[PDB]
Every structure is written in structure tokens, then in C-alpha cells.
Write a protein that binds this ligand. Structure first.
Ligand SMILES: [Mg+2]
Ligand SMILES: [Mg+2]
Ligand SMILES: [Mg+2]
Ligand SMILES: [Mg+2]
Ligand SMILES: [Mg+2]
Ligand SMILES: [Mg+2]
Ligand SMILES: [Mg+2]
Ligand SMILES: [Mg+2]
Ligand SMILES: [Mg+2]
Lengths: 52, 55, 54, 95, 288, 151
RNA sequence: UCGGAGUACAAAAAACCCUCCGAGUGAUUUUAAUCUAGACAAACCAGUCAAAAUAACCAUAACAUCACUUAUUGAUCCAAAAU
């Protein structure tokens, strides 16, 4: 099995990104992270796939 | 360099005080600098040696 | 209580603080090595520029 | 380092230094940490911070960088708006 | 005076034959001769160093050099283009007036500061002029008309309180050069050039009455000037009613370098004459 | 007598005369809050950290430039910093320049008068440091609750 | 190249084409912020801890967890991304 490095984006409309290792054969990742600009715990959805 | 202007009050705002009218009776004399200040300087050497020179 | 000091004891009223000791800093070094820039601010006297002969 | 140039007979500066360091007037040199832009997802928050710092060089390095750099880079600068003007002098140093 | 003189009667002539350099003045050089300084002569033994060939300065012996493993970061980035304002404290200005180097009577601009050697400007280093700092504010008692290229609120206030006038003016590099050292410029045999405007970055600075900008709208001046006095709690004097007021209001044209001269004139210093263009095109150009 | 395309008169046609800038609009601000002549301003110069204490004293009841309702509310909120001789006392510390200190004092005074002259001030209190106060109050009120007359 | 045990018996350090095990990652959700006293370690580069203070959330709510947990990693430049 390989994992993957995906770029994850805030739904807070603030451009903010953080990269995460996620299982290749798994579903598109969605998390609750901390956005520094809005200073809140918000929903992050995976925008892009960076590294393999 | 201009001789300093006479004032009505000493010492001046910047704290500069002219020499006296007569000279004292001491058996030594300390000239003013060409800028009319008292020639006491500080000097360092080797970064740690602090000295004070009277010229 | 304020009334007491003025009215009875014929005094000014003393007020106190709680003062904590100043934070401990190591001896300052000529070449602080691998130390954040803000190092130079710990030994700073007061925050105000001073232009020495200028 | 070129100690005597060909045309001018002066002493050249090594620019590769001027790009990555910053000389305060006191003689302290300042540098970024190494690998601070590299592989960030793999690192701790704490470590990330330790990397984001601006740090000072030890004496040896300072003398080295001085030798690799001409006199111009050691002059007293007054820049408008300068972040670092605060840091150029040294205070309360008992040595 | 010098009792030493009295000894000099007793001693033989001072001549070329007896002259001693001050002891310690010359540390005698040493040569690789003899048992001590010979036989390897301070160079060590074999290796690269005794032969003279050790590598260049930054080289660490092949491990990636210290000065190259650190990443590049703009520090000195675009440094040559940053603007540099030589600071002048109120402390030094006062000290200068007190000893009568600069006189507060006539208007004080850069050239006056330079001529008193209270300050030194080197345009080649991208000095754009003097900036005024507040170091001596509390102690500053003099009354002046001053023109600098930058100033701080506190400095300004400190000058207003004593009934003087501060104005911030801009000079381009060429202008500045001419302004600091006028007499070497007049030996150049060239007309007096126009003063350039500020670039787009510095315009919002010199257009504000906040800064007492030379390009500012004088309608705003008394207002802001009073605002200062509200903030620092002092009664603002009426400059209008003073006897030196004619000197205090004195300006320069935004296009003019000096006081009382004009762009395009030529100073003939051997004859003590000025020469002015009568031509229409020249007068249109210099006066625009 | 030089003039340019860019001169001060042709840039701003409206104002011209050389005395335009130095006019004093005393009619513009007639409010004149804090008539500084009426304050006692003391300077304690502490040099060593180098800081200059600047102090502003004035009699509260005898100060007429503030309205009566405001003059009374001030003596309530700030009674801590009022003096037995009736003096309100402000103090600033920070800068080495006493201009800046005086400015801090005056700004403090302006703000006190501002919030006291606002009837809309609700005096909102935080529960952070006052939780101890409310609870220890309530709990000394459990004991205080004993009812029989005395003296 | 990196780690654990012995060699190296009790602070640290300590070699061998010395004796033995490992690592070049998984799995999971508790998705693990900002800033800063003081230290460990150290030729340098790199590594480590960490109070107070802010902001997040119960409305006085900051150590990701497990696999011996220790190791699961790579400087500058330069390239791609646009934040
Ligand atoms: Mg010396
Ligand atoms: Mg020789
Ligand atoms: Mg020998
Ligand atoms: Mg021999
Ligand atoms: Mg030999
Ligand atoms: Mg050898
Ligand atoms: Mg200079
Ligand atoms: Mg140690
Ligand atoms: Mg904490």
C-alpha cells in the first residue's frame, strides 16, 4: 500500500492550506482543522493531490 | 570655527558653560577643545579595557 | 475604610501593590550563538531609540 | 576571496555571503535557519517554529563572514522604515 | 608655561643627528634568519600549508561550506535603492545653536546644517537628506525655521512649542548633491538645475499637512498644527505677531534648490555676477 | 520672486497669501477640553531604567469645565485615584520624553470624561476575576442571613 | 545513513571488515494553534524539552495514540506550484 500527500483547503473562504498523508485506497478526505485567519475550528476539504 | 555667542544665562539649554573670566590659581591648566568643550574622552581597547583620557 | 484614615486618624491613606521579582536573565554574551533575534531585547533598557551623538 | 582585484587592485566581496546574511552594526551577524522551507508537512509545530527563527552566528563564523566581505557592508546605515534599526547598537553589555 | 623648555637650555642642540622615534612607535619586524626564526620559518611542516597552497577562505575541507548551506533570504535585498535619512536630534541642533554654529535668525535648511558640520550627507550612499528625531525634545528651547526631509510628530511638536516652523521638503539625488556642497557646484560652470519631484511612493508623505509637507495644502496647516498642540498640551503661539515672522514664513518653490536663486541661472564667482537666460524656450523649461 | 508651474499658489489657487498657513482658527475648535492652564502638572524625573513620571492634579469639585452630572459620576468611578484634599490625580510613566507622558495623561482624562459623559455606559464586568467576588459574596451572605435585631 | 542491547559493571563520552537485533513506515482519530522566560545537546550544520501569555473549543477546555517508540530520514542551489 502507498499513502499520498494531499493539499487541504479551508471552507472558511480564507485561502489556507495544509498537507496531509492519507491512505491511497481510501475516500476523499474531510476534516475539522484550525484556520488561523478566522481563528476558528472550521471544515477543511481536500482540494488537490500534491505528492504520491 | 565661530567664537560662541554671549548669553544672558549660564549654563545654556544644551548645558554648555564658558570658562571663567580669570583663570584659577591651580598649578595646571586644561585648555578647551577647538570646539570649546572640556577634553575628557573615553577609550576602549581589546573590547574590554575602558579608559578615560584627560587631554 | 477610606473614611477612617482621613476622618479619624487624620492621615493620608496608604495603598500597596503586589510586586513580583524581575525575571532572571543570564549574563549577556558578546556573540549569542544560535539565539533568536529577540534575544537583544531582553537586555534592552527601555524601548525608545537613542541616537548617541546624532 | 580575491584580495587584490585585477582592474582596481582592491579587495572584492563574496556576494554569496551578502545574499544570505545580515550584518548589524555591532558586529553581530544574522541568518535564517537551514531547511526552514523544506518538507514542512513532515515536521512538528514546535520544530517548525524553531526553524522560522532568525538567529545569531558564533564568533568564528562572524570573523569569517567579515573577512569575506568588504568595508562597505559594515557601514552605519539609516534606512527609513527599517525593521532592524532597533537592533544595531548594543546595550548594557558588561565584558 | 612648559617647564620642559627650561631643560632645553641645558642640553645640546636638537639636530638631525639626535632624533628618537617615540618608544613603542615602531614594532621591529623580524626576518627568517637564525636559529629561532629560521628552519621552517613559521610555516610548519610539509602538508599544504608549508607549501603555501591551503584552499580559499570559505572552504571547509569539502564538507558543504557554512556560508553556503544557509538558505538565501532577502536581507540586503534591493538595499542600494532604499532611502537613507541621516538623523539629527534636537539635542544636537540645540547644541549647535548654543555655540553659534547655525544661527536661528535666518532660515535653517540642509546647506546650513552642512556648513556648521552639524551633519554630513553623502548622496552617493543614497542619503536622501536629514531626518529630525526627538532625542532632545524636553530640553529644546530655541526658536527656529527649519527644513528637513523627514520629521517625527514629537520633533515637530517640540519645535512648534517654541514658536518656530518646521517643513518637510524633498530633494532628488542630484539636487541633494548640489544642495550640500554648493561651492563645488558653482565651479562646475553649469546652470542651476530644476528640483525634481518626489517619486510615487513618497508623494503621500509630502502631500500631508500631518508632516508639514512642502507640497501640502496650506489650508490644512493651521488645523493639524493646532491638533498637535491639543495632543501635547501646550498653547500654540501666534507666529503672525512675531517680529521675525517674515523670515519664518519663507519657503522655497517646489522646483527651486536655493533661497533667492532660480532654476537656470549661472553663478559666475570670479566676477561675483549672476547670469540669467533671456530666451523664451529656456525660461519655459526652467520655470516649468 | 521666483514662481513655477508647480508652485504653491498655482497648485492650490484658493489659498495664496504667505500668512494663510499661520492663521489661527480659534473659532474652529471652541470646545477647548482640558484648559491646561487650570491643571497642576508635575514632573518627577527618574534616571538610572530611564523614565519620567508625569503627574496631572486638579480639584474635582472646583473644576467648572466639566458638567455637574459628569463631575459627580467621575467622583464615583475614579474615587480610588482621588485624594483626601479633593484632588483627582493622573499619572503616566512609559516614555523617556515627558511630552509623551503628558499626552498619555491628557488622553486618559479625555477618555474618563468621555465615558462618564456617556449615559449609555453599561459598566460591563467580566466573570474572570470577579467569580471569586460573586461566590465569596454569596457565601458570606449565607452566614449574614441570621435574623435577630441587635444594638 | 539512522535506532536498541553488549563491548562501555555505578555521571557523560568512547573504537574495531567487533558481538546481536532492527529502520527507509504502517494503522487510527483525539487533525494535534500562536507567541515566548529558561534550558538540554552541540566543532559547525542540524537536533531536543519548555513555564507564563494570547486564541480555539467543556464556556477558568493545548503532551495526537499504538506497533520494544527509540529509528521511519536528506543541506544549499535549482526547478515546478501561486499564497
Ligand atoms: Mg581608540
Ligand atoms: Mg617580512
Ligand atoms: Mg625555528
Ligand atoms: Mg641549518
Ligand atoms: Mg621539509
Ligand atoms: Mg603532513
Ligand atoms: Mg553618513
Ligand atoms: Mg552542555
Ligand atoms: Mg501554557
Amino acid at each position: 500500500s502507498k499513502t499520498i500527500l494531499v493539499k487541504m483547503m479551508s471552507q472558511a473562504g480564507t485561502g489556507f492550506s495544509f498537507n496531509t498523508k492519507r491512505s491511497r485506497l481510501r475516500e476523499k478526505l474531510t476534516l475539522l482543522h484550525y484556520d488561523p485567519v478566522v481563528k476558528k475550528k472550521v471544515l477543511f476539504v481536500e482540494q488537490k493531490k500534491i505528492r504520491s | 570655527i565661530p567664537r560662541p555667542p554671549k548669553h544672558e544665562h549660564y549654563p545654556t539649554p544644551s548645558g554648555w558653560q564658558p570658562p571663567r573670566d580669570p583663570a584659577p590659581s591651580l598649578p595646571y591648566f586644561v585648555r578647551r577643545s577647538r570646539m570649546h568643550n572640556i577634553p575628557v574622552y573615553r577609550d576602549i581597547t581589546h573590547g574590554n579595557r575602558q579608559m578615560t583620557v584627560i587631554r | 475604610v477610606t473614611r477612617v484614615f482621613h476622618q479619624l486618624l487624620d492621615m493620608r491613606e496608604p495603598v500597596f501593590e503586589f510586586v513580583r521579582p524581575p525575571p532572571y536573565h543570564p549574563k549577556q554574551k558578546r556573540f549569542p550563538h544560535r539565539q533568536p533575534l529577540r534575544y537583544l531585547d531582553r537586555y534592552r533598557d527601555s524601548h525608545e531609540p537613542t541616537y548617541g551623538i546624532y | 576571496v580575491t584580495y587584490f582585484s585585477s582592474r582596481k587592485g582592491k579587495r572584492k566581496t563574496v556576494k554569496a555571503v551578502i545574499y544570505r546574511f545580515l550584518r548589524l552594526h555591532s558586529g553581530l551577524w544574522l541568518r535564517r535557519k537551514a531547511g526552514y522551507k523544506k518538507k514542512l508537512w513532515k515536521k512538528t509545530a514546535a520544530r517548525k517554529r524553531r526553524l522560522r527563527e532568525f538567529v545569531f552566528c558564533n564568533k568564528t563564523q562572524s570573523k569569517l563572514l567579515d573577512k569575506m566581505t568588504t568595508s562597505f557592508w559594515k557601514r552605519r546605515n539609516w534606512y527609513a522604515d527599517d525593521p532592524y534599526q532597533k537592533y544595531q547598537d548594543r546595550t548594557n553589555l558588561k565584558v | 608655561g612648559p617647564r620642559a623648555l627650561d631643560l632645553l637650555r641645558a642640553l645640546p642642540r636638537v639636530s638631525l643627528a639626535n632624533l628618537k622615534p617615540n618608544p613603542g612607535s615602531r614594532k621591529p619586524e623580524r626576518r627568517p634568519r637564525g636559529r629561532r626564526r629560521g628552519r621552517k620559518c613559521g610555516r610548519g611542516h610539509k602538508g599544504e600549508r608549508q607549501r603555501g597552497t591551503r584552499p580559499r577562505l570559505g572552504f571547509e575541507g569539502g564538507q558543504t561550506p557554512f556560508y553556503l548551506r544557509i538558505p538565501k533570504y532577502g536581507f540586503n535585498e534591493g538595499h542600494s535603492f532604499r532611502h537613507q535619512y541621516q538623523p539629527l536630534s534636537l539635542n544636537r541642533l540645540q547644541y549647535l545653536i548654543d555655540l553659534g554654529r547655525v544661527d536661528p535668525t535666518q532660515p535653517i535648511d540642509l546647506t546650513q546644517l552642512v556648513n556648521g558640520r552639524g551633519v554630513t550627507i553623502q548622496p552617493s550612499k543614497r542619503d536622501y537628506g536629514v531626518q529630525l528625531v526627538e532625542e532632545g525634545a524636553d530640553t529644546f528651547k530655541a526658536k527656529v525655521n527649519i527644513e528637513v526631509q523627514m520629521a517625527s510628530e514629537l520633533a515637530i511638536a517640540a519645535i512648534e512649542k517654541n514658536g518656530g516652523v518646521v517643513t518637510t521638503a524633498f530633494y532628488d539625488p542630484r539636487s541633494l548633491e548640489i544642495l550640500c556642497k554648493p561651492v563645488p557646484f558653482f565651479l562646475r560652470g553649469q546652470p542651476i538645475p530644476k528640483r525634481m519631484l518626489p517619486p510615487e511612493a513618497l508623494v503621500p508623505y509630502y502631500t500631508d499637512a500631518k508632516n508639514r509637507g512642502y507640497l501640502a495644502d496650506p489650508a490644512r496647516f493651521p488645523e493639524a498644527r493646532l491638533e498637535l498642540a491639543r495632543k501635547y498640551g501646550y498653547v500654540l503661539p501666534d507666529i503672525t505677531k512675531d517680529e521675525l515672522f517674515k523670515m519664518l514664513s519663507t519657503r522655497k518653490d517646489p522646483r527651486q534648490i536655493f533661497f533667492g536663486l532660480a532654476p537656470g541661472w549661472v553663478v559666475n564667482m570670479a566676477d561675483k555676477k549672476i547670469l540669467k537666460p533671456t530666451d523664451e524656450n529656456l525660461l519655459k523649461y526652467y520655470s516649468s | 520672486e521666483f514662481q513655477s508651474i508647480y508652485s504653491l499658489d498655482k497648485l492650490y489657487p484658493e489659498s495664496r497669501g504667505s500668512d494663510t498657513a499661520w492663521r489661527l482658527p480659534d473659532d474652529a475648535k471652541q470646545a477647548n477640553d482640558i484648559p491646561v492652564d487650570r491643571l497642576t502638572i508635575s514632573y518627577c524625573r527618574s534616571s538610572g531604567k530611564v523614565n519620567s513620571k508625569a503627574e496631572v492634579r486638579f480639584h474635582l469639585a472646583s473644576a467648572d469645565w466639566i458638567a455637574e452630572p459628569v463631575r459627580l459620576k467621575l467622583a464615583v468611578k475614579h474615587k480610588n485615584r482621588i485624594n483626601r484634599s479633593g484632588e483627582l490625580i493622573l499619572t503616566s510613566e512609559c516614555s523617556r520624553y515627558q511630552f509623551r507622558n503628558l499626552a498619555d495623561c491628557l488622553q486618559k482624562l479625555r477618555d474618563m470624561i468621555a465615558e462618564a459623559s456617556q449615559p449609555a455606559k453599561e459598566p460591563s464586568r467580566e466573570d474572570a476575576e470577579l467569580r471569586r467576588s460573586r461566590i465569596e459574596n454569596m457565601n458570606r451572605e449565607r452566614l449574614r442571613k441570621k435574623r435577630i435585631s441587635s444594638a
